[PDB]
Amino acid sequence: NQYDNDVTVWSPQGRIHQIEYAMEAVKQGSATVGLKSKTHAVLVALKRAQSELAAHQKKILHVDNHIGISIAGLTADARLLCNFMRQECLDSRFVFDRPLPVSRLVSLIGSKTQIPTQRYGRRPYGVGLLIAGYDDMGPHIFQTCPSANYFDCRAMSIGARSQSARTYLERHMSEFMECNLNELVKHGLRALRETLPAEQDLTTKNVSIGIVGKDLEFTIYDDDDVSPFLEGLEERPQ
């Protein structure tokens, strides 16, 4: 147990436990699912209430006109990476006068989160960022982790009880490349409804859906515009 104190201290098994504990902070937050077609990349999150009459905490937040991210984990590390995220997006607009390629922006994050996972004096960032974007070669779905690894993927679900969402995505990933937004969005939010206890339903007040498109700027819909998306659904087989 004496090796379980700092980021610097290695173990006699070769595993640093402080990085292994920051993965556990990702499982505290709620579930969120991102996926993409050939032309459209949609990530869908799940709000959580604090009390019975407070507003629900937002998950999806706009970054750039072609980049939007989701969140899972500490809200302190959330806005701290967002302010680093927005600063790098407008520097390429100010210098190069082009939007950033999405694949090389995430490489700046892995260089950003590597220093506080090696030097003493700062904990690792407990955060579960899902990233959707548009470079010149189509849509992308990215995830990160507090071990500073970033994974390109075509579908991903992270957060609380998100293993049941992964099983739905693996047996329907062959259908995702062809279908358009009227069902591609509700292919995604059929995966959230297995990350729920079996007695309540995904309502209009606890879900956010963000869409960025090839000809569409990144747009966040919540609590009023979810009703054209929740129409035309079946119930759970209970």
Added chain:
Amino acid sequence: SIMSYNGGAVMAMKGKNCVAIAADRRFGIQAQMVTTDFQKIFPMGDRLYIGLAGLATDVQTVAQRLKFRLNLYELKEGRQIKPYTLMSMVANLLYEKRFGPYYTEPVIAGLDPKTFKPFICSLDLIGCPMVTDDFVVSGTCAEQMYGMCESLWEPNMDPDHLFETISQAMLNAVDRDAVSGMGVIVHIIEKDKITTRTLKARMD
């Protein structure tokens, strides 16, 4: 010039077993005097004086900075300061302001603390030491002071004739100067005592 802003004249002269130093008394801006009691000779220990001439700011400034370093020297060591040691101390203080220099030219006169050996030297405004055996002069009316000392100085002189020689050298040269005058004070020191006299000069 900047040296000619307030005037001044400091002369030192070596005798047989004694040494003398003299200066003027006039304080003033370029053509307007202010007072006739401006001190330009400062005691730095017994039997060892220093004279300053030039810009009246740096006269009062360096004499306080040198007093700052002398008292710290005479407490780390129980002895007093040697006259060669003070010359190296002043030359260090002027050279630190190599490009921001003080506008003064110091004249150091005094005896040895152990023996009776006199010592005279003068420095430039950036700290070039220059020891002699007969006299050193500094101030605005320098060229008049060389004309009097080259003709009146004798090698081995009692304190009687040494006082009379430095008196006639200061009176006849400063009266030729315009921005210096209004009284001359003379210090003559020796092994046994210190004598200070003021002279009857022209007050115009």
Added chain:
Amino acid sequence: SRRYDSRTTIFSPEGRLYQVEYAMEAIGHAGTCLGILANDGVLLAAERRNIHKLLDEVFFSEKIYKLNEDMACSVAGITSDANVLTNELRLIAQRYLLQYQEPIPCEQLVTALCDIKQAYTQFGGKRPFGVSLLYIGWDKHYGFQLYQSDPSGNYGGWKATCIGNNSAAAVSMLKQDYKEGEMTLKSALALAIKVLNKTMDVSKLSAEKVEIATLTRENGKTVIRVLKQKEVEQLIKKHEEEEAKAEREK
């Protein structure tokens, strides 16, 4: 790191200080210094440590440090730590003279040191000064003065004080024999040699084991007289003569 650090800054659960009380006890296991006022003077006395017969003593002063021109100080505690404070304190008294061209008036010199000695008990993890030391001097405003520095930073203006656990019985003696009002130099020197007769347990009071320095305001000069060992001898024999009167009553 964290497990290598010393405390030096942490209160007790009852509120007392952990390291400051320790440094105030090491001074009691050290030399003895005292002072006494007079109507026209002030004096200091000291105890010689390491009186081995292969030393030189060429400094003319070991416990006494003539600090500005009209002030001196004894010292007690860690001798290696003591040289830092004296070179600073002469340097505080000398930058005052550069600033006003008037000597330092013997109180705000002490508070200038007592703020420096205090600051190591506060911020910064550092070792405090284990040195208490005396003060003598003269000013325009009050005259002859004594002061009592502490590792905590406290100072007090005393009429007759000394060191504690080494010579704490002297303070009980000074309350019995120091009479107020008349305390002149010949009366104060004979009072001082009586005290060190008891506290220093060496019999007959060998003159190589003591050290006495005085200060008299004399014709506008304020001399500081470190009196030589030749006149320590007859000062002892004057007190040695007082035993002959002390046996007449019995």
Added chain:
Amino acid sequence: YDRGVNTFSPEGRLFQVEYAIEAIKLGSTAIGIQTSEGVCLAVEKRITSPLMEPSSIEKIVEIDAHIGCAMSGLIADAKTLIDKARVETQNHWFTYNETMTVESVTQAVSNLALQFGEEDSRPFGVALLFGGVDEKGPQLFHMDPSGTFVQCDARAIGSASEGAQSSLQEVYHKSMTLKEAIKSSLIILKQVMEEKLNATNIELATVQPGQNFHMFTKEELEEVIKDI
């Protein structure tokens, strides 16, 4: 060890942040309620001595002429938060000629609380309630030492805040009025404190759209007590 200054749990949060929530529990209670007519607010002073001056204890301060406040927990750390909350709403008027909205105040306030450590020390021990009338009508917000910022419609924080929030969710509905919500709040106050409810125990704070003045009632509050 046992989770010292900056080290993750094997399961969840930092316990220094978790113990910062517990420091609010030894504070003083306070209730804020949002109504479409305006934002009412209340607090308990907890005055100990009669020689102790009553009007020196502040809990409602004035951040700006349309933004009120409420605090609980540590008073010593709350004076740091109120200081820059007054400054950076004033910097916004200097460079934009307009009033900063109520939500974007606490954006700047929640940046500074998430800065404990040695980077360029300890977390804070104070929760806050912010009332105000921006361009979207009246608003009410709440923050914690964890930086978790959220909008509430009616919120009670401080000591005995758990028993306050249970009965408070029954008496609230969407169509309240401001004259109704003030007496609806102080009934909850005298049921959670122990002293007799008078004009020296509590104080009120109301902000309106047309009445951006008068964020502090003073001895008109004596009329409200005798009416209930």
Added chain:
Amino acid sequence: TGYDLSASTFSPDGRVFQVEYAMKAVENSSTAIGIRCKDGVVFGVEKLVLSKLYEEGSNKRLFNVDRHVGMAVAGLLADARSLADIAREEASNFRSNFGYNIPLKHLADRVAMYVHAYTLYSAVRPFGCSFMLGSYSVNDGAQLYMIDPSGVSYGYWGCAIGKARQAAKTEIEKLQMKEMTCRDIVKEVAKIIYIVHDEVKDKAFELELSWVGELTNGRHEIVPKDIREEAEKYAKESLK
């Protein structure tokens, strides 16, 4: 054991266990091998698919440091990304100060001294990475290097980094690598990967082959094995 906390402390017998602990963290990573022929260097990495949602070419371990220099990392992948950016930055200053390409013998010295500096202070930890360096030139030929987490760096003809470090170099040394061409090497690298535990107790995998030498005119790029698929056609015939 006990004093094994800091990297700036010695054992009572004279070794640092924090360097020893980080070496066998590289042991748990999958096998990446390297080999050079007489006119080139051929890399090869066994890389396993995480579950299914990997998108066929993500998070690769065949980097590209310079115009003629690339890496074959294994171990903690995030720690190798920060270490690869040092070698990208180090080769740029040699260009800007001397005007020509970095020699591989000088490049491996600059990197290994940088890895050495994280094994001395108590504030930082040693790296958890080991990697390969291969290059080709006309005045120097082909070279192949090897850097451990401690910082020891010298040259090989062939190597392996991962679980099967010993189990791969047993059958590397039975090749006549001194005279083969690096087109015949590519079909021989793929069978070394597929012999030792490609998907036996694991789930799945995908082969990556990097490539530098005389046929690329000094360039470093991935193989056109996608073209004609000949590595898997020749290695899967070794089932019996």
Added chain:
Amino acid sequence: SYDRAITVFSPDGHLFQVEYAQEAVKKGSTAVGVRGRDIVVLGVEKKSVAKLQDERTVRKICALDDNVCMAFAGLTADARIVINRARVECQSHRLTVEDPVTVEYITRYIASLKQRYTQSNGRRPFGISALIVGFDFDGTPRLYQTDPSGTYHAWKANAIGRGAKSVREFLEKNYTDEAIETDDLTIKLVIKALLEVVQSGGKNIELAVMRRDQSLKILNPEEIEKYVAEIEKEKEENE
């Protein structure tokens, strides 16, 4: 268990090293202070001269500016830094803003300087508590107090030091809602309050008053002995 740091919290949310600084205040001599109609007054106890020292260097009552006073407790070293710092701020305020300094402004400086002095590690907090009394802000008498946590606060009658709980309970049954006019009556309230001293020797009380227009008026041990006589004159009505 866990304290040994000013940045760590307890499992029930406490700062014990801050709370231990208030325990050092209770080792000090008691000092009381009330405000009145025009004349404010504060007194201290426990002089205890030791037969061989000068008593003008043990002073516990100082003035920051011309119309504000100071009384403290705790340990003598940390008070000297706070006093010397507060003299600078109440003088540099006058240079930047040409008004005199209010009594409320100088207490926020002392509290905020003690505030940031608690936050950073390796900075031992001040173990003193202070009483700031001044009828300076446009003819209005006020008195505040401080705390080692850094919380400035206003009372109308105050007691600190070793035995403050008895005196503060005494003044609640004694400070009349009838305002103590004829200000020698208000001074006699303090001498009656300081009569419950740790030993009550009578000649160990150093009362200092201020008539809100003049400077500080340190009382002599002949005028204060007259007020001790009339306190025994009112005590003759018990029989």
Added chain:
Amino acid sequence: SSAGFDRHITIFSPEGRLYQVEYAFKAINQGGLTSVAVRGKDCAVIVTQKKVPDKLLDSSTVTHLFKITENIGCVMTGMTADSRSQVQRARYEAANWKYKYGYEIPVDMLCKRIADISQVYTQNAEMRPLGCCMILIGIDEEQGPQVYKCDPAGYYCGFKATAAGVKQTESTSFLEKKVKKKFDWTFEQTVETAITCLSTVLSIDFKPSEIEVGVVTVENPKFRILTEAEIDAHLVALAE
């Protein structure tokens, strides 16, 4: 005794000892290596073996003989990573002498400056004290050849016959019996005792391709590494 943290950091123990530096004295001994230097004549000879356990491991990138300047060569024992970083300071500060002072650095002056860097790591804490050892040779004009040796503690000396690595106590005992009749050291008497000491302490009687020989001589003062052919010439010359 273990008082405070004397077994962990560089502080004094009771009885004036300190353990974190004398743990570094047997930090050399994990190399499995032994180096011998002999001064007898107007020449100076280094001899040190190589240990090649792998046929995939190269031959030219094994050499412990390091060329500091043209007239100064050295050999390194101990662990490899601390050894090459120590040489980077020795190559650096030998050139600062030429720049600041305008002539070639003496071998005596350089061994001072290297040991002064190892001083501060013992003096200051949280700084690991470089568990390796350095032996120098060179020609000084009007002084003949010299052999110096540096310690991790910062201690240096100059002496005629040197052993290092693992087997000092057996080799230095052999050389005192050798250097007590000061016979004619004639540049082959020096090389033969440099071989026959190591060939009897290790007791191998080895093949011509496992050692290196560094040499410097009053005639050709350049540092010079011997060739495998002429190493074999001296090896068969002692076959009597």
Added chain:
Amino acid sequence: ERGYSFSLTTFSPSGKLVQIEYALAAVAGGAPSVGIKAANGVVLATEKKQKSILYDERSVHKVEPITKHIGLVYSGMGPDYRVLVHRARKLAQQYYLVYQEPIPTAQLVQRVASVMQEYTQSGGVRPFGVSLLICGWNEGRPYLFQSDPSGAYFAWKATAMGKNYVNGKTFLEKRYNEDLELEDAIHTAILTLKESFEGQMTEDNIEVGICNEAGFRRLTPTEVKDYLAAIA
């Protein structure tokens, strides 16, 4: 780096400094030495034996000059000595750059002891393990001082540091007097070093430096062989 900045020395509850008392134990287990102040000079001597017959003697010196009239020896551990030697060289030139005059031996010990003070109080460093003996003939009278790793200093007539110093302390007290010559002082300085030496004493086992008024001078082995040539 981090910037840790904490000292490794605090007070005991008894009031003693623990690590400084441990550093004097490493001083007492060093090579022995002796220094004698005569009526016209100061004599320094030391014990320089190699662990082998291989070690050259013309490489490392024990008696070491500071100025041309100031020398300095030690008893403790080897490599810590060369730090403060090079520190005292640069310090002694700074007096000469200001005052144009060679430094007196009293003023040098005022500043070298302040350097040894600074490693005892500052953060994370350890105190020295070397005591010194500092000599010199300035202003007629010669001087002989001794500085310890605590930071204090003294002024001896004759003393001995190193191993068996309590035996040499009694032997110098029973042999020295008020005055001798310098040539008589070296004779009683080897006879106190012959007390604790090994079975053989040659020109290369001891090493002697002197201080005449003509300046500082360390002796070549020609004189030291001729001095121990049957004159004890």
